[PDB]
């Protein structure tokens, strides 16, 4: 005899679930016995045992016996009817990143402040079996379990959900975690990631990142380092063989400062391309410590002379960044040195040509978040003459 | 030539430090050059370069040259004059516990919210060299470094202090961490740890823990599992060969609930004994969920009958603890099962004798902290008769 449930063995709280049992095509009456608590249970070689509303009293192990003319038959295969949604959901994150190479392992972390017994990792699919881990107490408070995932083969999507339960009720689980998707990244030609805005972004500006491909990718995914999830847009192909997508991030805040990569995939493939070259988004006006800029000889100089730009601060910044107005390339970063009661970096422009003329600004930053910058220094005009 | 500092190379902020240089017993004048910043410095084959108050301008590398009749001599051994106390101190803890076996390794953890570059571990001693590690960003925020310590030989004390600094100022360190001591535990005969109070302690009661030894230990250390530090008392010997110490913990709070062990050491030895048998301190009245106690047949029973005490709760406790009034042994713990809309544990007293009569109480607890209990149930009187 067999025992199963039509919607599934994992049922959310307060939703219908039907249990079906199968005999040997000939039986007078079936009986259902929950393991331990319920003695009796009752409700065409099949029997229907409906539960209009799933509650914690129905969660447990179920067995089925069909009574034939010769007597009671063998016990059926036990069925775990799991209820979910009884506790606040856990958190689920990828340890290095949700981006993993095609093949190769990675770690997922279940996490909650109350899940001190067991965690369950479920993978989206058809006949996927859950994995259980013992919970671990963290030094800073809370509980976590680290699930090894891999090798991540690019034959299908990889989506996961976290659960926790307690020892006394093994079939009563918490609310599901937010799903997390894992992207396998291959060796296909990388896209190109370009920014439409300047090197350093003022708060409130509009930012649009643009991916493009000369091999004709249909989907594009933009991922920022250190985040849980990614963005996803379809690719536009006005001309065949050259696709592109735009990621409008709206008014920029401090959370928009970071390192960005984007990936492309074809129409019927779950494998993604190699990452683009990283793009760094810098946000000015995040630190109120001041910086100043000054030319060591002077603003007005002659060609061929030794000119040094000095960005200095009374605060102990970690690095300084020099930007030229009109320049599209990323700013030049230099570590700070401790001088005569100041912290400074020297930006050598020796020998000076006529192409070095323009407006310069400098910024300070700390290594804790090297994408959040200070307010710009007062602009400096470098004048050159033959 | 040599270069050193009398108080030491690690000097707290705003304290005197003196730098001495030694030549070839014959030199007209010594000179001191700080690496990079200061060119000149000046202030019987020795020269005294005093610093009335140590500041961050004096922190760096120093070299000494003595000028003889034949010219300048070789550069001296560079001296790293380190200033401490410039930042808030980090935290320092032992990963499993400060108790380690004699020999064998352990891990110390430096920790701060700002130490994102480097951490320094200093061991107390005469000529101990500091160890530096790169900082690691934590998922929950903050920074840490994990230092391998071992093998911990019981020839001396093991005390450590944590520091952090930044890349731009390598010789400017934070305030020292609180010192942490490591105790090597050997295979000497374990002490005995007894409690003067009952099994379960009500909040506000006085608790005194008592260690004792029949081998004549002079020092006693009491350690509670999961803590950073330990307690330490000298042992009293009214009679030779039998020492003891009392650990008065005052009015008990929730922080007094835990697992306790204590160790003993002799007068001129840094090796400690084997741990005592663990002692668990339970604190009642910490959980406001209710438990109740009832005899399944009834309070009044006859000897030889089957009697079961049932502690149950509407709340989903993890375990139940049965306490008999007057009993000195620890309470009996049983996991809870899910019943007819209740959670309960059955405490079998079948067959019942005349020694089972008395007053019984039951408590609930959760596995997150199994030493914090609920309020006691209403007392039950078990009456037996022949």
């Amino acid at each position, epitope marked *: 005899p067999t025992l199963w449930a039509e919607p599934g063995s994992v049922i959310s709280w307060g939703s219908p679930v039907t249990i079906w049992c199968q005999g040997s095509l000939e039986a007078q009456e079936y009986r259902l016995d929950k393991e331990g608590s319920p003695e009796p249970l009752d409700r065409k070689n099949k029997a229907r045992f409906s539960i209009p509303s799933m509650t914690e009293h129905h969660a447990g192990r179920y067995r089925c016996h069909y009574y034939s003319s010769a007597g009671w038959s063998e016990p059926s295969d036990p069925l775990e009817l799991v209820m979910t949604g009884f506790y606040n959901k856990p958190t689920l994150s990828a340890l290095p990143s949700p981006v993993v190479a095609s093949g190769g392992n990675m770690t997922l972390r279940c996490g909650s402040q109350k899940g001190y017994h067991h965690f369950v990792l479920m993978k989206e699919g058809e006949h996927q079996l859950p994995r259980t881990l013992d919970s671990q107490q963290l030094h800073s408070g809370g509980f976590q379990a680290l699930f090894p995932v891999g090798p991540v083969n690019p034959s299908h999507r990889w989506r996961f959900t976290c659960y926790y339960y307690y020892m006394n009720t093994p079939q009563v689980w918490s609310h599901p975690s937010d799903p997390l998707e894992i992207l396998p990244s291959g060796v296909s030609r990388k896209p190109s990631l370009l920014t439409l805005q300047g090197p350093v972004l003022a708060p409130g500006q509009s930012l649009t990142l643009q991916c493009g491909s000369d091999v004709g990718y249909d989907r594009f995914v933009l991922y920022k380092e250190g985040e849980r999830d990614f963005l996803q847009r379809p690719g536009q192909q006005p001309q065949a063989g050259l696709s592109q997508a735009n990621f409008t991030l709206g008014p920029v805040s401090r959370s928009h400062g970071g390192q960005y990569r984007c990936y492309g995939a074809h129409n019927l493939s779950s494998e993604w391309s190699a990452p683009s070259d990283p793009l760094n988004i810098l946000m000015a006006g995040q630190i109120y*410590d001041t910086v100043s800029l000054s030319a060591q000889p002077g603003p007005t100089v002659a060609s061929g002379e030794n000119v040094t730009l000095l960005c200095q601060s009374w605060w102990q910044f970690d690095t300084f960044l020099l930007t030229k107005e009109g320049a599209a390339h990323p700013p030049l970063r230099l570590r700070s040195m401790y001088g005569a009661h100041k912290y400074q970096a020297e930006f050598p422009m020796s020998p000076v040509t006529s192409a070095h003329a323009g407006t310069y600004r400098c910024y300070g930053s700390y290594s804790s978040n090297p994408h959040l910058l200070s307010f710009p220094s007062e602009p400096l005009e470098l004048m050159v003459s033959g | 030539p040599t270069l050193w500092a009398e108080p030491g190379s690690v000097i707290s902020w705003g304290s005197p430090v003196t730098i001495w240089c030694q030549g070839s017993l014959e030199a007209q004048e010594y000179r001191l050059d700080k690496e990079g910043s200061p060119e000149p410095l000046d202030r019987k084959n020795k020269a005294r370069f005093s610093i009335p108050s140590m500041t961050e301008h004096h922190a760096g590398r120093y070299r000494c040259h003595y000028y003889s009749s034949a010219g300048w001599s070789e550069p001296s051994d560079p001296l790293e004059l380190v200033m401490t106390g*410039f930042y808030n101190k980090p935290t320092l803890s032992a990963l499993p516990s400060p108790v380690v076996a004699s020999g064998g390794n352990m891990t110390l953890r430096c920790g701060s919210q700002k130490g*994102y570059h480097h951490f320094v571990l200093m061991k107390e001693g005469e000529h101990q060299l500091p160890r530096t590690l790169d900082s690691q960003q934590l998922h929950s925020g903050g920074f840490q470094a994990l230092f391998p310590v071992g093998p911990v030989n019981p020839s001396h004390r093991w005390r450590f202090t944590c520091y952090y600094y930044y890349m731009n100022t390598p010789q400017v360190w934070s305030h020292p961490s609180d010192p942490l001591e490591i105790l090597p535990s050997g295979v000497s005969r374990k002490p005995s740890l007894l409690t003067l109070q009952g099994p379960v302690l009500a909040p506000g009661q006085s608790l005194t823990l008592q260690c004792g030894s029949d081998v004549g230990y002079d020092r006693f250390v009491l350690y509670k599992e999961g803590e950073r530090d330990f307690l330490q008392r000298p042992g009293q010997q009214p009679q030779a060969g039998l020492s003891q110490a009392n650990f008065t913990l005052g009015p008990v709070s929730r922080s007094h609930g835990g697992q306790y062990r204590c160790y003993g050491a002799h007068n001129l030895s840094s090796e400690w004994s084997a741990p005592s048998d663990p002692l668990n301190i339970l604190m009642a009245g910490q959980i406001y969920d209710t438990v109740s106690l009832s005899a399944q047949p009834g309070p009044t029973v006859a000897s030889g009958e089957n009697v079961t005490l049932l502690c149950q709760s509407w709340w989903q406790f993890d375990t139940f603890l049965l306490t008999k009034e007057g009993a000195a042994h620890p309470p009996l713990r049983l996991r809870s099962m899910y019943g007819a809309h209740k959670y309960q544990a059955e405490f079998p007293m079948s067959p019942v004798t005349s020694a089972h009569a008395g007053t019984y109480r039951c408590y609930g607890s959760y596995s997150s902290n199994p030493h914090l209990l609920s309020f006691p149930s209403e007392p039950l009187e078990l009456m037996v008769s022949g």
Partner: nanobody, 115 residues
Framework: QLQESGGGLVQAGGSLRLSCAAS????????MGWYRQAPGKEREFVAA???????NYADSVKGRFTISRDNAKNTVYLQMNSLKPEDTAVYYC????????????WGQGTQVTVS
């Protein structure tokens, strides 16, 4: 967090003293000082002092304002002298040099209306 004092207003050539007391965390090791807004303008830097008793002064108030610190009570003082009319602003007590987000701790503000 931060509590300010010594507000008000005076005529040209007058003198006012600002005070700022700190509570809630460790503020011994970071610089403390004043920034000021203005009608239609942004927050500039005015003055600061750190643990090593080193002072920082904006060029517009150099040699006119004096900052002092009490390391025992985490309290800083500003001694404004020769108050010019362009000092009319809302001065903010600031804890800078945090090196991490939010990089600053601001005071609720005080009004100076030198006219």
């Amino acid at each position: 967090q931060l509590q300010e004092s010594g507000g008000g207003l005076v005529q040209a050539g007058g003198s006012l003293r600002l005070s700022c007391a700190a509570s809630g965390s460790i503020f011994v090791y970071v610089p403390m000082g004043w920034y000021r807004q203005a009608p239609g303008k942004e927050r500039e830097f005015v003055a600061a002092i750190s643990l090593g008793s080193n002072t920082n002064y904006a060029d517009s108030v150099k040699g006119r304002f004096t900052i002092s610190r009490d390391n025992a009570k985490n309290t800083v003082y500003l001694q404004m002298n020769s108050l010019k009319p362009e000092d009319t602003a809302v001065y903010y007590c600031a804890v800078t040099g945090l090196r991490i987000y939010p990089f600053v701790y601001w005071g609720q503000g005080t009004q100076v209306t030198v006219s």
